[PDB]
Amino acid sequence: SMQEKYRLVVVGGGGVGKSALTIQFIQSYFVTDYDPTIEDSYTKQCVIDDRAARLDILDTAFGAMREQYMRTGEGFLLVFSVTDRGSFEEIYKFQRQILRVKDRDEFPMILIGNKADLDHQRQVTQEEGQQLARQLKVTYMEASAKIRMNVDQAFHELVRVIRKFQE
Ligand SMILES: Nc1nc2c(ncn2[C@@H]2O[C@H](COP(=O)(O)OP(=O)(O)O)[C@@H](O)[C@H]2O)c(=O)[nH]1
Ligand SMILES: [Mg+2]
The domains located in the chain, with CATH, are: 1-167 (3.40.50.300)
Burial (Cβ within 10 Å: 0-12, 13-18, ≥19) of residue 110: buried
Asked if 76 and 111 count as a contact pair (C-beta separation under 8 A), the reply is: no
Shortest-distance Cα residue to atom 11 of ligand 1: 15
Pocket test for ligand 1, best of 18, 41, 123 (most atoms within 8 A of CB): 18
Distance CA 43, CA 122 (A): 32
Residue type, 121: Q
φ, ψ dihedrals at 132, nearest 5°: -60, -45
- H or E element in which residue 64 lies: helix 64-72
Q: Tell me how the structure was determined.
A: X-ray
From the DSSP assignment, how many helices (H) and strands (E) are in the chain?
A: 5, 6
* Resolution of the experimental model, in Å, one decimal: 1.7
